[model samples]
Target: VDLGDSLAKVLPTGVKVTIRHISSAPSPCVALFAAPPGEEPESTFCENHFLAVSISPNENEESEVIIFGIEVLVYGTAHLTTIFVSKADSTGYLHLLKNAPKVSLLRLISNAFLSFLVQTHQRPGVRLMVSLFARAQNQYLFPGSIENPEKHVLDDRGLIKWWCRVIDPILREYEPETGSHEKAVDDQTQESAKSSATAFLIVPGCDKFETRGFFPITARSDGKDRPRWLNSYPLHQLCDNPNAPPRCLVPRFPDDPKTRFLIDLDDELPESTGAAGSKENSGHWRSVKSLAQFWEMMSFRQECSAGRLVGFLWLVINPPGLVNSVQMTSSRVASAFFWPDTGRGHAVLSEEDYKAAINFLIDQDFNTKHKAIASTKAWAEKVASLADQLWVGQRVEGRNAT
Candidate 1:
């Protein structure tokens, strides 16, 4: 083969390393070799090399054959999952040109849909997706006491309504897209196990919503008479109203496993309530009538598909247009962000410029600073150190590929 011939030339006069013709590949096709254990890709002493390759019907408008090579370091191995894209008619070729694009467009795709993916994987951690509730100052943290409580949870009709229309769309934007030539996404339309995160509601409410405690409250007000503030709730309750959309969350039987809200949670009706002593009366509880009144609430957890209530991040609102998310830097955080950020204009901030920005926030009394940013960076560095172990993903072919 031309490839074998080309590789033969580098004999170093008499270098003993032989170029074995183990296999001769056809054109317009692809081959993915999952580095076998012990001989994993990462174990390759040097960079993975595609020393030689030859095309069948060289680049032309007619045969339309495409020939290319790929090496991916998914998550665990320091080496790449060796890949080649050949024959215009090959499954790998079709995946690169067709099927990959179709599903990538779906707003619900996440890293979990891939064959070998981890960062794309949403593991057990506290990562929350949220949109700003408001920019105005917190009535409690700053000025007003018992009166002004800032909004943290979504304002859309009910939690279910927002989950349907808003939240799902935004989070999915963070998922992977764009076929980097090496593609292998799950063609099964089912949602992933790692898709749902354990989320908690953050609203500047009391230390507790009702003793029954549904919404979660984080810390105390930084004020003297710390009137229990900075609240959290089962965002699921945003929906339980008679006029609101019914909870489309996982269906639970009376015998199902317990979730965060299942205990304090009231029955969907007088019947669906678990045998955990559903107050036979109407919907009110036998022991706690007050909690029953508020049990009109709703919360969803992984006790279903795979959920954790992972957690919710604060959606800060700085009136006049400013949110000092130092670590979550969006603009200097960079307008150019995640994968999408790549498409936008970027402002590379220098130490001086970055400091100036933080100084500006400080002037406005914004809690933006580098300390927290560095903290996350520290965690990220630690995470990067573990890359060799986490790089366990690989590119796969879609079922419909040619």
Candidate 2:
């Protein structure tokens, strides 16, 4: 509640952040709300931000909890929406008390939260996707502060491997794409309709043997070409393997032409687009000839230039039992499963929406303070009501499982 209250106050008017108090839960969750100014809290639409978190059990110590599994998602309204998994793979051990013991079960704990979200938030008509970069930064949350003593940080390679291992179980649960004939095609369609999830990971310095197990056998095998789903597959594809069919390549950075072009781009075009050109049409990215060229130039960017090898990971999740039907109507130009390019179906959150939904959480006035005792008491009562609702839901889930 402290975090929630702080966030609520700092947030712009009409936006609210609240937690689903799971007093005895297998996991805890947080929700972000949006409403017009002066609207009631309950009346606010629970749109955009949804976070599902996990906690380690108290090991003999009095109420000791090591929070982890920070999966952050942004979704549109209801069952028929596209879910963008913005971030995951985080730990709270650094903020723990000095005497509390630490455990190394992050793999198990992190995977548990993702499985929970998949089962609960995902429906039969939603397209879920995960896109994140595995970069070893000291503090993504509190950038300059060095207050915490025990920050359990991983190196770049270690972080990449851990993230791969975390999602391995999820990838294994879905059947790999296969083919035989017309019958095989039917089988594939049916199986895909149930669940057609794929994982794509590329570590710049690793070879074939290192990244072999990260991807599965998808019969379509279109990794060589640029993936259409930019929201799901965010990184530019690199075709490293020439003989072994076309698999996505790990890009390189040489002259960094893209970065250079981007600099020149800023001066040529004014802040607001005019008759000069449509911003999308005149974009420098469109000028890149191939994925190989894209990565080659990208490597020279100041951010990626500092001798850092990044791990690009993506998970494209299709809703169960509806993809086959949607596939039939998919056009040559666009996919019916993903959010469309125009107005309401804009695939991912627009720049305005992104700022409203996410940026404020981090870019707020942290120096402001709320009445500690009063706010804490109010938050506790809110948690009590939320916890009761959560308890009832768990009981109902147990009954359903039985």
Candidate 3:
């Protein structure tokens, strides 16, 4: 009755066979034999068990005998086998099963859910749209970086936190109004207005808060660093200094009659006049007195006219380098005379002043080059008339009026 023993039995019209192996020591000496039509049979050993089953599909086939070392049994028309061994001996078989390829329903479901989440949340215009797009694109395009967590093998939480900290404030400030599901307006005009205002006010104040922001002080300081004005050098010293003479040192163009009269007067004055003390009355006194009176008359006109003449000269020259040079000179002049010495109202020349100088030079050059001064002022008046005509039909309505 022991299935491990070698035996043959008959039940109804079928024969049953059993085989067993009882070696005292483990050995690879296993074999199998089957008689009759099962003569050329195949044998296999698996997990210390030898299988030698005669495959007879029908009762009409010749009777087959099978023999093998190990456990085997036949019941009805089937054979069952079991191999016995120590637990440790089945390690290789256990490994094969443990490392086998497998499909998991839960794993498939989890993967599908993750893919859906990625596609849904990571898009061009999501809540954190820019970051989402960057992460998604970088994950595929620029893999294995801190910006792309899925692609990177190392911890990238620090990078994520930094980026979020940077972009979160901007997003919060520009967040859309809730409840109204209207398309966001990309109003560049509003953006430009905000930017211009921030340039002078918000940006400088924000410098202390933002690490990368920098503020520069454009206002000049007081005390010893204060800028010098016209009174930096005394007028008498500037005029009389032989090494560096004053700019308006040359006298105005003396009239021809006055020049001739002065020469005549110099000739008419006697070299000496007999006085009571017998000292000679030299002509130097009379000549010097006359020249002094003439210089006094011309001084006021020269000073007032010099600055304007210099500005006109700059316009006539029109050299590229003169642009900045003339601007600085004009700034200095304005600061010294018209505005406070703090240089606040540096742009002294008005738009009209500039246009006047330009027109003067143009007309002067035209006369010099072509021997005739064309009616440039009349042309300018026509231009003004046309400009006024342009706004003739542009009437303001209600709130549009300034």
Root-mean-square deviation per candidate: 26.0, 13.2, 52.3
Return the lDDT, model 3, position 268.
50
Candidates ranked by TM-score? 2, 1, 3
lDDT of 2 by residue, 89-201 (tens): 34334243333223344454445445544555554555554545665654332221223234456776677667766676666566443321113345545655567655766
Tell me how far the alpha carbon of residue 98 in candidate 1 is from the true structure, in angstroms, after superposition. 32
Task: Say which prediction, candidate 2 or candidate 3, comes out ahead on lDDT.
Answer: 2
Error of 3 at 84 (Å): 99
Candidate 3: worst-modelled 10 consecutive residues by lDDT: 309-318
| Deviation (Å) of 125 in candidate 1 | 30
In order, what lDDT does every prediction score? 0.22, 0.37, 0.20
User: If both were scored by TM-score, which would come out higher, candidate 1 or candidate 2?
Assistant: 2
Please list all clashing residue pairs in model 2, or write none if there are none.
238-249, 253-299
Off by over 4 Å in 3: 1-227, 231-250, 253-374, 377-402
